[PDB]
Amino acid sequence: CHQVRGSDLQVCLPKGPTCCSRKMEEKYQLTARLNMEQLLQSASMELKFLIIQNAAVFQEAFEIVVRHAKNYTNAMFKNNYPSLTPQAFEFVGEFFTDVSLYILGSDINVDDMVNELFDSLFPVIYTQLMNPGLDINECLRGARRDLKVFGNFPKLIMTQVSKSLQVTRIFLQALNLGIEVINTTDHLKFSKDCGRMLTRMWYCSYCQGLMMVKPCGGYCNVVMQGCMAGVVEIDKYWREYILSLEELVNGMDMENVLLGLFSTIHDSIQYVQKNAGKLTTTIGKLCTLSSRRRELIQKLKSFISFYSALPGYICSHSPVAENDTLCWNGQELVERYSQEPVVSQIIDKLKHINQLLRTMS
Ligand SMILES: *[C@@H]1O[C@H](CO)[C@@H](O)[C@H](O)[C@H]1NC(C)=O
Ligand SMILES: *[C@@H]1O[C@H](CO)[C@@H](O)[C@H](O)[C@H]1NC(C)=O
């Protein structure tokens, strides 16, 4: 043994003498772990950055659309229903606040936003528009629904906005989930047998005192196919996630729906006032964007074989003798080579988001 870069070892199969002890064997084991990790990192980096890019852009683009709709809706109220301000400035803000929250994954029930909106809207219509001239607020909030003053305008808005806010939410959910599974890949822990085999493949030749010999490609594939056995099962679910995503995008907006809200609300106010006469009395008694989507799907399809091409990536981006001549077989230099929990969580997450994508478009 010159420079290197009995027997009681536990990894390197000792044909006879050996250059390395049990302690240098443990060194070689940890550097195999570090090496596999770096390689997995490099495999997943470009795809990870792609989805990180678009998740950040699309989130702001959608946030811009909500802010613009809020101000337009606020301005339309200020201009057409000044008697309803400043109260309108408050329930419009309440609604679009929940819009963004619902878009970004918060537990928000759409039927509320609409119902809270109309529950807040009706008392100020009654007091300021229908019968001009504080303790009686809660009665009017209850009579709004008990007397169905807006007809089916709330249901109409409910379906108008729930369909458009659901697709936008799920699109952001799927982008962030892809980041989360791909980022999990470079942290995948493998079996101890795989680690011992990786050590034999990459480093045990130095223990026999060889300097330039590389492992056989065939030996690398048998080793890698054995290491990535659970990982390759993820391929079919990843391909369905890509295709389901491509389905959603080809089917697509939220701007028109949210911009159109004031028009629908205004007609709902007109409906109510068509009944002010009798309604007062009873209440008296009672009381390039699309271009970005395309380019993302284009780049995303180029990575559709990520999990199936992964073992080949590790073998090709490490020194191997793909020729299978004068190569290291794990225990001797040969002339020609002859012969889950975390994974299941990735599966489950891909299954869940793939249902959500399917049943949308
Ligand atoms: C548009 O709406 C958003 C809502 O948060 C607000 O921050 C922004 O200042 C508005 N722009 C105006 C009022 O010019
Ligand atoms: C990636 O995974 C690591 C470890 O699991 C975690 O610390 C990090 O926050 C994750 N990053 C993203 C963007 O998911």
Residue numbers in the entry: 35 to 39, 59 to 186, 192 to 310, 315 to 349, 383 to 434, 456 to 477
Article sentences:
Guidance receptors of the Uncoordinated-5 family (Unc5A–D) have emerged as key players in navigating cells and axons (Hong et al., 1999; Leung-Hagesteijn et al., 1992), where they trigger cell-cell repulsion in response to extracellular ligands such as fibronectin leucine-rich repeat transmembrane proteins (FLRT1-3) (Seiradake et al., 2014; Yamagishi et al., 2011) and netrins (Hong et al., 1999). Unc5 receptors consist of two extracellular immunoglobulin domains (Ig1–2), two extracellular thrombospondin-like domains (TSP1–2), a single transmembrane helix, and a C-terminal intracellular supramodule, which contains a ZO-1/Unc5 (ZU5), an Unc5/PIDD/Ankyrin (UPA), and a death domain (DD). In agreement with previous findings (Verschueren et al., 2020), we show that Unc5 receptors directly and functionally interact with the morphogen receptor glypican-3 (GPC3). All glypicans share a similar architecture: a structured N-terminal extracellular core domain, followed by a C-terminal linker region of ∼80 amino acids (Kim et al., 2011).
We solved crystal structures of GPC3 residues 32–483 (hGPC3core) and murine GPC3 residues 31–482 (mGPC3core). Human and murine GPC3 sequences are 94% identical and the two structures are similar (Cα root-mean-square deviation, RMSDCα = 0.54 Å for 353 aligned atoms). Crystal structures of the core domain of human GPC1 (Awad et al., 2015; Svensson et al., 2012) and the fly ortholog Dally-like-protein (DLP) (Kim et al., 2011; McGough et al., 2020) revealed an α-helical architecture comprising an N-terminal lobe (N lobe) with 6 conserved disulfide bonds, a central M lobe, and a C-terminal lobe (C lobe) that contains a furin-like convertase cleavage site (RXXR) (de Cat et al., 2003). Compared to previously solved structures of fly DLP and human GPC1, GPC3 has a more curved shape. Superposition of hGPC1 (Awad et al., 2015) and hGPC3core results in an RMSDCα = 8.87 Å (for 358 aligned atoms). We modeled glycans on two predicted N-glycosylation sites (N124 and N241 in hGPC3, N123 and N240 in mGPC3) into evident electron density.
